[PDB]
Design a protein around this ligand. Structure first.
Ligand SMILES: [Ca+2]
Ligand SMILES: [Ca+2]
Ligand SMILES: [Ca+2]
Lengths: 502, 502, 502, 502
């Protein structure tokens, strides 16, 4: 007995939503089963298409009875503890989704082909076209409201930035295949409607068996190329409208399936992405309603694609938008304050240096939203080896240096940048990660601070004497020579660490 | 007497904005009233369309006199207290919107059909085409500036994420119906302009009654199929341009309304979504201006749809965008700090565990924006039963435990995660909701903490002694074995609760 | 002498950017000047179009010499104080934009028509077509880089939410007019290229004067309808491609300008919004390059519209998006915490009540970003009359009640909502704006609090005694009966006001 | 030896990604090499196109062997210090990208033209068409997975707001050129497939050499214009479908390259931006698959453009959106509080004055994110000369005035705005930058404060006496006469500066 967030179901019920897109990608294959033999002017059956659609539907419908038996041993919880007991798992399923799952999985086209049509009354070709049209209609509803609750089951738990656009592009291909096989079947039905109407006014006499094919009967009603003209059209006799391209190309006579599939799929793709622009309909109402439905469905898909894409694109540009709004803010604040050009280009230098190092990421906000031992292991990797180069800090344990790694903040310094000047109070104690720093004094000798060296060691002796609250006056003037990365130790954060050291 | 936010008006004035879209969805039905009988070459009247458009307009125009009487008893307020007094409710309405509401509701097409046209001078068919063209023009303006203030009344108070797109898709259908009935009427007028011009140069002699279709008169000017060719076109004689499809399909002769409606609605839908691409106009100026107007209106609608959709789409992805930006921020911060792979995959584990639990929701910010008794009832449901398993906390009342439920913060812990180690100061007191926790000590024996158990009970005895400010040293090392949900009690938040307990 | 933010220039240099769109909306009118007389097979001049384009260009080019003299008395500032002195205003202008402003304003088409063409060598009709084609080419560059710095002058200072879309829709109309008059002129040039090439192989003898119209000559080369077929096309002789529609419609022969303008503007609008779909080009390279340029320009113009529209749409939905995200955050936090349905629907009631009152606006953040005297005048309008109903607060001056109006915070309460219960400590002092409140006590009698009444008067006597820090215990249980708006006075904010009262 | 962020590589490996777009913009030039001579009905070779494509490919393939030798001396780092040592630089490159970089740079079309085809068996024209079709196929894969890691190398480091749209517009031009040369080559192959099939059923007898075009042999199979009709098409014999336009225009026979390039590039641009709308395919499967691929690629390309443009557009409106939301928040907060019109238009005046000065930029947040010496140099430019007009502040050094420039905050005041009134406590000390201020007193005389003057000098003597904590009472009422910019000095920030002055 399992629960819906258990690892077996949560990896197996993603294959079920996949096999329900495979299932609706094979239901229009039964529309390619009726055929027209244009020599004898008869409606026929593509027998090998009839087998191909029946076993492709079966092999995806013995994959959803496996969903039915995996909902008899699923997990209800409450109105914190799951229910592992049957006869209430198998009573809410039988009150919520069991019949829709069993009306969607019944082999209704495969059983009407094997059982019902060879024992029906009339022509086998007309019965096959009429049963497979309506059974695929009447099973079209539970095969789509079985995917509504199974998607509500996975909105309570794939995703990438582009997955909404890739599923959108697949929805073009599925709808183009559905609309084109509908167009195939409606083209065959409009030609047989022409044949029936021409036979009910039989100036030339018509025999009604011979509209339906039968290999025992050779030859059919030969006058039907006059009353139902296709290769040269006469819309006074019959306007075929948007179905004339299917009857002129001979796709309704071919028994070659990739020939038949690709011509009709491309009709669906051409007219969905055109929003029905080039559909020259006749005055027939249901042909117009088909073209209206193609126009609306393509109108709804294209707008989704443009959106699913501008979403992919904008997902990938936030920190970069946020930098552009800050660079344009550093502009027109300078030239509203009328800053001199030596001040403005130092501002542009720091904001570009902060951008190429951090990329908009606030490191302290990123680390504070981590757990206290994971944040400790990061800051002991970054900051602890820098603190071991101060000749006093080895005297502390792994309880006070862990207070110091917690209080080290990363700072950035461009070139020409002054860290401190002689005479200023010392706020920080730096621990240099990168860059070279020239320090001078007039009290002369010029020292150099590289990676691993530390500035501000006047401040430790101030924040150890248990002393004045005014900061010690800098005896050195420290200036950066290259881009400097460092870790800053503030005065009061060092003053806290002084109280736990005696 | 009512006020505009009162419950009667605020549910009844949403039916008024609905009946004003039904009203503009039936005004182009009067354009389907003129008819052409192509045998006799006469302009006629569809009499049953003339009744259908008159009673569909009446039954939506006795639904807006109900708006007029519901503005005589509405509520003015001031330049906090509403005005319930008449003769100033019925004086600002008569200075703001009363005449536009009464110019929009006058039964001008129904009264010109029943009264004015049977007592006019000329032909009844030409008068019906000319009056219904211009009255639907001249009443088109107050039937659209009556929806401008009624929409300003409901911008001061439906909405869903997709309602802007569903109203956009309905605006296609309304504009396609308007543009297609305009195209129907302009096609009839271009054929009668051809008939008038052919009769003013009568090489073959023409009688001007017979352009207008009387059932007493049989037969008309038979030479008009020569001078106004339609079924085979000659643009030297007359170029019908974009109206030739209406005259060749026979939609201007049919009295079958769903035949006539669907052919013309589809023309409007095909050419709006094409932005007027396939309109092969003639050199006639107002035909070009009609095609320019179709092109602009379809540009405007399409751009709105694409926007209304991307809004729906983005309305559904904010917290999920915010997770992807944080994930792209965690990457390239790791590999800029060059973190080891044991540290990086622990970061990715916590940020994915925090995502699948919280989905970006900050619980403390969500609870703090709630009222103080509603926030109290939530935290007494979540946290109070967990506090009753500490063997001291039953000694408090429902005034001090309510201070403790207010200070419990939810924390998350992945697997392998250390809560505390032996030797560290104890900051928190946990109250485990989920997961198993192995605690050890070397002072050996290994205990286990499950759901309902609590960690950090060294800290209560510290924050009861009225003691040192340094936290007690942990005697245990607690480590998570599975994903742990818990509630954390900080040291100073427990130190507050100690002062109200004696 | 003026400065660029002075009120004269800043209202007058918005008419200058308007007259520079009027100027480029009249430059293609010189392309409608050449004409073809198809009877005599001659290229001619539309003389009244030649006057109309010359005075429409003049009346917008004596509107930009006014820009030249308003840049001789403009204001330079520095590399805070403007420069009001000439000879340096009129030396940077002569080094930055003076020649581009004078190359754009020279009456080069009007002066080649009046002076240069009547004193040139060759045919007056071919010289008019060739000069007006190239002078409008060679003055097309400075009439567009004169709008680049003048737009940089107004990005340093109209805007609405829809102005980017309305300017976008105007950019369709301007580009359609430019592209269609280009198509008009290129159609005339392709027919004369046919006439010249047919005359250089004169199996039928051709006289080269007679391709150019001269009203003295009557009759021209009559064989040119054979070698340059238009009304029935033969692409073996000459393929006119995308220019055949202009030569067949007779728009290149008409001297009726609104006939000629609207047919060519509609060609530009039809093919820009089609992105060049229906352009059936010939194999001519520059015809293809024209069609490639129409395709790219429409591709760029459409993408901007879709963006400009969705900016309009999203601008108007920020707080409403922010409410929908908060509503989707309240859901799945409830049903992740598994809250009972009495708790969940109270949460949905408060968040919908807060939405319909505030519409996402934080009032305290809105008021704090206002100046201190403007924020004082608002809070003395809202809160001071409510404070005058407490019978102690009239004893204070307009220095201490102004401290109380500064500390009053707006609160909201739904129905059934408990303000305080008997036994709870009293945190707030309410001042009711709206709604009715039933207060009870068991110490029984039930009082009622309406608009103007105040709750929490136990707390003033606590925060006047100079007393315990624990809050006074509520003797009443106050519960809301309707939606309550009130102003809350916190305990410590009342404790501050107590120190300035003795 | 260099590293990937070193200045030589980081400027030279942007030319490498440029020469890899030039490289894929010249691979379809080999598809323009086969030619059809329609008189003799033979497939031939364009010899000068064969040289032009070979030297344009060579001159961009001796530009990527320079990338191969610049990856033998690049910089590995670790699993902070780079590796400058060979034999491990040249062992990971030989395990990651060396063979894909050498399979992409091999001169396979140039060497099959010069070496392999003159020593092959069969016809030289059929071998040239078949080798150049498949070698450009088989080298198409490593010439595109060589740009995947080189782009991953520059996502770890151009950009502008419009660069994603300009690269998108270039991706139209590259794909249109690729698709149109594919269409050129597939048009030639469909005509030769027609010639082969007509020769395998030789009612009229066909000689198979003469399908391949040798200058020694004059004349070919002349019956092929009957069985493969092009100029008048017969789809019963052969349906050329979407390739008929190439065979009818004679672009497959022309040896004029800009004629041939522009006709085929425009076919690609017309059908990509149409998403394959106007492609009238035949029933041939791979022609349909080509048209399906054009439809999908244009569907993806267009959606990206619309997104890349709306990103540009929105990049430019983030602060201006933020002002419009704040303006829509100020409205309906006023008229929910029912503020009087003298209060509302003062609110609209300040929020518009703050907008035209600051443009949404928070100056204190902008300055605080700058380094402490750069922020000091800005505030000494803005604020120090204003502080030197107070007659006491020259007595301080450059250590205490630097504390005062750090604490000066910019304030804005509209006209009619009261700074302080007589009787109010003085919170601020202003330092006027702009505007005139009328100050009065009743203790009368009216003074004036201009730029450089300072208000609030009652407060310095309060915050120097080492005194009461209550602020001094204003003896003046100061009111603005024009828009005032000033710097504010708060009372406690002046009280800090008092402690360091004795
Ligand atoms: Ca289109
Ligand atoms: Ca089209
Ligand atoms: Ca489109």
């Amino acid at each position: 007995i399992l629960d819906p967030q258990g690892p077996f179901l949560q990896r197996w019920n993603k294959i079920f939503v996949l096999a329900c897109i495979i299932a609706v990608s094979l239901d229009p294959l039964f529309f390619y089963v009726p055929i027209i033999d244009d020599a004898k002017k008869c409606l026929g059956i593509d027998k090998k298409m009839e087998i191909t659609a029946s076993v492709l539907r079966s092999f995806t419908d013995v994959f959803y009875v496996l969903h039915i038996i995996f909902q008899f041993r699923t997990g209800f919880i409450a109105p914190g503890v799951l229910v592992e007991d049957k006869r209430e798992i198998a009573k809410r399923y039988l009150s919520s989704h069991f019949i829709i799952d069993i009306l969607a999985v019944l082999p209704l086209p495969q059983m009407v082909i094997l059982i019902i049509i060879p024992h029906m009354r009339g022509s086998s070709s007309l019965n096959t076209k009429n049963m497979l049209k309506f059974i695929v209609f009447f099973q079209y509803i539970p095969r789509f409201i079985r995917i509504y609750p199974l998607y509500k089951e996975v909105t309570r738990t794939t995703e990438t930035a582009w997955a909404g656009a890739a599923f959108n592009l697949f929805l073009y291909m599925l709808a183009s295949h559905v609309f084109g096989a509908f167009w195939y079947l409606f083209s065959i039905e409009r030609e047989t409607v022409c044949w029936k109407q021409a036979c009910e006014r039989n100036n030339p006499p018509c025999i009604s068996k011979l509209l339906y094919c039968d290999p025992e009967t050779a030859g059919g009603n030969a006058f039907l190329n006059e009353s139902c003209p296709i290769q040269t059209p006469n819309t006074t006799l019959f306007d075929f409208g948007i179905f004339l391209d299917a009857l002129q190309s001979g796709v309704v006579e071919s028994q070659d399936f990739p020939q038949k599939f690709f011509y009709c799929f491309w009709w669906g793709l051409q007219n969905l992405s055109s929003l029905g622009q080039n559909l020259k309909t006749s005055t027939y109402i249901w042909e117009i309603c088909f073209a209206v439905f193609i126009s609306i469905a393509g109108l709804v898909l294209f707008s989704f694609l443009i959106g699913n894409m501008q979403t992919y694109l904008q997902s990938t540009t936030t920190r970069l938008e946020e930098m552009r709004v800050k660079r344009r803010d550093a502009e027109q604040w300078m030239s509203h304050r009328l800053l001199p050009e030596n001040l403005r280009k130092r501002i542009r230098r720091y904001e570009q240096y902060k951008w190429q190092e951090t990329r908009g990421v606030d490191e302290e906000n990123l680390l504070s939203n981590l757990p206290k031992d994971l944040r400790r292991d990061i800051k002991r990797h970054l900051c602890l080896a820098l603190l071991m180069r101060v000749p006093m800090f080895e005297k502390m344990d792994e309880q006070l240096l862990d207070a110091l790694c917690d209080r080290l903040q990363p700072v950035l310094y461009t070139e020409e940048s002054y860290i401190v000047r002689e005479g200023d109070p010392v706020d920080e104690m730096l621990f240099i990660m990168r860059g070279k720093l020239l320090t001078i004094t007039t009290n002369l000798n010029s020292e150099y601070l590289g990676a691993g060296d530390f500035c501000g060691e006047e401040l430790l002796t101030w924040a150890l004497d248990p002393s004045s609250s005014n900061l010690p006056i800098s005896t050195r003037t420290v200036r950066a020579l290259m881009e400097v990365e460092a870790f800053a130790l503030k005065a009061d954060d060092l003053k806290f660490v002084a109280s736990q050291f005696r």
